Paper text:
We therefore designed [name], based on our crystal structure of inhibitor VH032 bound to VHL30. [name] bears a cyanocyclopropyl group in place of the terminal methyl group of VH032. [name] showed a Kd of 90 nM as determined by isothermal titration calorimetry (ITC) and 80 nM in a competitive fluorescence polarization assay, affording the most potent [name]:[name]-α inhibitor reported to date. The cyanocyclopropyl group fits snugly at the far left-hand side pocket of the [name]-1α binding site on [name], with the cyclopropyl moiety projecting towards the aliphatic side chain of Arg69, and the cyano group pointing away from the surface and towards solvent in an anti conformation relative to the amide carbonyl. This corresponds to a highly favored, minimum energy conformation for amides substituted with electron withdrawing groups at the alpha carbon next to the carbonyl, as well documented for alpha-fluoroamides. Interestingly, Arg69 adopts a bent conformation as opposed to the extended conformation observed in the VH032 bound structure. This bent conformation of Arg69 has been previously observed when a Leu or tert-Leu group of the inhibitor is occupying the far left-hand side pocket, as well as with a bound [name]-1α peptide which bears a Leu residue at this position, suggesting flexibility of Arg69 could be exploited to accommodate a range of different functional groups at this left-hand side. Altogether, the biophysical, structural and cell-based in vitro data obtained are consistent with a selective high-affinity engagement of [name] with [name] as its main target.
Author numbering:
A (entry chain C): 62 to 203
B (entry chain A): 1 to 104
C (entry chain B): 16 to 47, 58 to 112
Amino acid sequence: VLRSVNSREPSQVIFCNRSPRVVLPVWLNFDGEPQPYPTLPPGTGRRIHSYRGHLWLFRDAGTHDGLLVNQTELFVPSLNVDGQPIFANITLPVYTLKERCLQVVRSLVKPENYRRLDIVRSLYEDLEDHPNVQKDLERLTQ
Amino acid sequence: MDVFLMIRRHKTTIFTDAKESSTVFELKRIVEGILKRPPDEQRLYKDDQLLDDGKTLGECGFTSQTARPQAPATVGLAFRADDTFEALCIEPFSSPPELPDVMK
Amino acid sequence: MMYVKLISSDGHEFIVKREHALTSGTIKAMLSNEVNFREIPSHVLSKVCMYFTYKVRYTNSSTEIPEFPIAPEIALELLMAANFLDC
Ligand SMILES: Cc1ncsc1-c1ccc(CNC(=O)[C@@H]2C[C@@H](O)CN2C(=O)[C@@H](NC(=O)C2(C#N)CC2)C(C)(C)C)cc1
């Protein structure tokens, strides 16, 4: 259901990483599979060639935490007016306090040891249920 | 520009914001609204330094890039009982326990 | 402006805008002007209040968003408070 359209009309884009994370761009191909692209260090930019109708999302390359692009989940290159490229502004979301705590705890505890933590069973489940692109593709497809 | 503050006395801590261009006296009026004590019964401090009423929060070093929403600057508060002012006392927050083994 | 008072397990009294404390559905039910938290100490509840200020400031704003900082020593306890308060 969620997939790029094989339009064949070029569209130049600037990927601008305004987050403190290492960024992984992901293109959804014509069969809807996620294809990973080269990463962007924090604060850096890249001029890239894409196409109208194509779909992109953006993640933390290390943890897969979700990121926003022009204030939303998905980015679709549009028609270039006057030769100017489209701007893709990649930023941190305002995570809930709970999700931000889970990030920090995941980054300090090896996954084999989550069960040793002195917390209620459902938080162990929340820790093991880490961010992942397929999971989100289901949800967004809904 | 907004500055984000904790105003602290004893075991009391107020979270609020104010303009960089606003005055010390104006902050006392805020405190007055919340704790019901007039400006003449209040002293405000930055660390150990007493603050003058007519000076801006900016002049006294509270700037938008140091007094941040997620990490606000502390302003000390002392009250006058009867004739004289108590000394500045700010109760520290609790200590975190040791990191569990699995987090080391 | 309307304020409420949130009190930690060790007796620290935090005074925040009512709008900000309603960030939490659990706090909303405990009010509906003071709330006592018997399980949350001051080194955790102070950070909770800082999150309210951060969320309200940076929700729906295009000015680049900075990372909300959490020291390793307080992370486990803050997680449990966040789960209880649903925030
Ligand atoms: C250098 C870099 N850093 C971070 S991302 C990045 C980077 C590196 C290389 C590219 C090259 N462009 C592409 O791969 C674009 C992106 C996406 O729109 C798909 N794509 C294509 O060229 C795709 N081509 C096409 O759809 C068409 C062709 N040809 C039919 C028009 C294919 C070859 C992957 C099927 C784009 C971005």
